[PDB]
Amino acid sequence: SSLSDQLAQVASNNATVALDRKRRQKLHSASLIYNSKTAATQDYDFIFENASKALEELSQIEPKFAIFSRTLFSESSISLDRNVQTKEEIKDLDNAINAYLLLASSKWYLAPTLHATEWLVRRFQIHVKNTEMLLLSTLNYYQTPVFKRILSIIKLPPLFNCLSNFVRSEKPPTALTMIKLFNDMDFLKLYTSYLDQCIKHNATYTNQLLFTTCCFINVVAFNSNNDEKLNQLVPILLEISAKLLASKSKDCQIAAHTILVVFATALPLKKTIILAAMETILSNLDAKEAKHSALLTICKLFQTLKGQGNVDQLPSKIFKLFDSKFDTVSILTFLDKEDKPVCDKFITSYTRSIARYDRSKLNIILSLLKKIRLERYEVRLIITDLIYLSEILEDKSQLVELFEYFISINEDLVLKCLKSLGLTGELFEIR
């Protein structure tokens, strides 16, 4: 290309190294704490000693920082220069920095981590070189003067380009701009990589997960009326949904339930992928809040299923697994909940599966059929499966009790299912 941009490239390459006094002070004056004319007279040992004090108090409030004392906040670290050593030890350096940054992603409400990280900024120059992990680790606190400060001193990466009119503006960046930051899969694959590192370090927490989930449902909201964009956007959100369920935290599990429920009501998925999602959210379900939320999200997932085969049998290994994680009386009291969420298609598939893969305890199906109301094709398919069951195994008092209940309400349904299969005289013969 041309000469001007051809060496603007090498200027951006060697922006980290100070070449004289003017660029040295224009590089040293970046700070998370002090302003320019104060920060231009600090030395390294001063900010190092107050940062080490900040670190040791931060390490007694969180016991996983003495390793960074031993290897990154040591006394030789003030002499360790970054851009004087080879690519392999700079790779060691910035993955250690990334470890520290995701570890200290939580603590940004309290000033010890500000004074702990400001020496890291001033010495290892993460505000120019290691900028990405810094931004998308502290992205949760976007209404805070720490984020306004760090965005005022940052050099802005090519991904976060929507924020470049929020540098040195007193207005914090707004939620709409955060959505427009999140609204391309070049950013989203990056952010899912970061969340994968947070999962496999268990550095997840209730505020980062809340913010992440809220921006993801807002991204799906903006891509509601773009079918090609939504189908383009599936295999990353569902990917970290499945990676989010693999962890142990109740909060990330119910965040996975949140993105799953909003995505299922966003677009109609297929039966095989929604069944894999159902068994996946069941296969790592431990805490009671996760039980409650997973039951709600399973019911809504199955409610947003259309086309034929919607109310069919869930198979045996997902059915017994659902019964292993959820006993029948939990289903009964959830149906006894007074809010009455619409769960008719899931309860229809549950009735057909308990009548086909257990065929033993029909007090359950009679009780919950009394407890909810249910629509006509659902009860037609239930009583068809009941006709087949009543002819394969011999009739019982429970079976004929629910049968005469379906006599007592809406006779011509079971009459027309007998017209499809036999005759009411033959059914009274099998009575």
Binding site: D94, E132, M133, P157, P158, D186, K189, L190, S193, P235
Partner: protein, 385 residues
């Protein structure tokens, strides 16, 4: 018949036909040898100009061609023609009436295979001259040993071995002593593509159901399997610039880029080539290059480049989707009506049965370009119907 007024000259405006092309390197250049019906053509890959053509046609249609450094090995009805700079330098007549199907070049031993699982392998008279000129031996795969042949190649770092890929089995050879060495396991469906990997001694092989098996021939096992729903696979390749990327090409006109380090679809490409003319006949990475050369059966050759990543810290996880780069095409159906544009006999116009209009240039064959159907807007207020 022979004539006495007009002599035929060249069939212009024609790029590919559906035969899998080949590629060759010269220094740090790349040339693409594609087939057009009977003659072939040699493009380069940097600016995608034409460079060479065969100086005279073949008797039958070319069924299979390959390319070493300077030389192009064409293969038609019974023979294999070793060519240099588009000029035929040596015929090689095979010792049969059977029609040749595939071939490979490695080291000294050329190896072609007919349509009855019979493999003529040839050898250079002097281990210093330029092309295999002398018949060495004739292997023959029998139906006990596997199915009927579908490819053959010598994958790397193998001391004078060879790999024949049948419809049911993989089977090696030691071509010096003419010996089979290792039949592979059984494979439960028809496989149709096998391309080697730039990692040590494994070969990726895709079936008529959409799975890619990765056979490790030194181990004799399979390493991984990429499953894909109901895709008639057609053409595999690997990317060799360090960052490992597999690339499958489905005859439904699809091009799927798989990562292999984390088994993820990087990006799909839909309807890149037309479905009905064969789909993706052959697609390959240029080695040491982050570009893709695809060619369909619909008279089109394309290049797709992979951009550098936008995540300067993350890097290999965030991969930018493939752009579109240079491409050369004609219309894919026989041209209906034909005119000459200028008095200088430089441009000519075609309009074809596939309803496209092209301005071919018979002077220099990178100037030919499609005319564009973008309506001038009605500046009196009307709407386009």
């Amino acid at each position: 018949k022979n004539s006495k007024i007009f002599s035929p000259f060249r069939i212009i405006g024609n790029v590919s036909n559906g035969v899998p092309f080949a590629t060759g390197t010269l220094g740090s250049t790349f040339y693409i040898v594609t087939c057009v019906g009977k003659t072939f053509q040699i493009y380069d890959a940097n600016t995608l100009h034409l460079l060479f053509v065969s100086e005279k046609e073949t008797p039958s249609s070319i069924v299979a061609l390959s390319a070493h450094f300077h030389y192009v090995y064409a293969a038609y009805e019974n023979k294999v023609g070793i060519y240099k700079r588009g000029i035929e330098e040596h015929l090689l007549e095979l010792e049969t009436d059977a029609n040749v199907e595939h071939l490979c070049i490695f080291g000294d031993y050329l190896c072609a295979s007919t349509d009855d699982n019979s493999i003529f392998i040839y050898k250079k008279s002097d281990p210093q001259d330029k092309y295999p000129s002398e018949f060495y031996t004739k292997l023959t795969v029998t139906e006990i040993q596997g199915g009927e042949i579908v490819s053959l190649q010598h994958l790397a770092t193998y001391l004078n071995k060879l790999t024949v890929v049948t419809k049911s089995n993989v089977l090696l050879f030691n071509v010096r002593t003419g010996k089979l060495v290792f039949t592979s396991n059984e494979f439960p469906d028809q496989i149709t593509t096998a391309e080697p990997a730039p990692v040590l001694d494994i070969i990726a092989l895709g079936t008529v159901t959409g799975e890619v098996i990765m056979f490790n021939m030194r181990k004799g096992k399979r390493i991984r399997t990429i499953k894909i729903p109901q895709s008639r696979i057609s053409s595999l390749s690997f990317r060799t610039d360090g960052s490992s990327h597999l690339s499958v090409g489905t005859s439904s006109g699809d091009l799927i880029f798989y990562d292999l380090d984390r088994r993820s679809r990087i990006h799909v490409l839909k309807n890149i080539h037309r479905e009905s003319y064969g789909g993706v006949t052959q697609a390959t990475f240029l080695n040491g290059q982050p570009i893709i050369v695809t060619s369909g059966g619909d008279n089109s050759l394309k290049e797709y480049v992979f951009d550098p990543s936008l995540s300067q810290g993350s890097g290999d996880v965030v991969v930018q989707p493939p752009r579109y780069l240079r491409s050369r095409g004609g219309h894919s159906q026989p041209p209906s009506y034909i005119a000459f544009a200028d008095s200088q006999s430089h441009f000519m116009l075609s309009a074809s049965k596939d309803r496209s209009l092209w301005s071919f240039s018979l002077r220099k064959d990178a100037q030919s370009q499609e005319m564009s159907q973008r309506l001038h807007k009605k500046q009196d207020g009307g709407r386009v119907g």
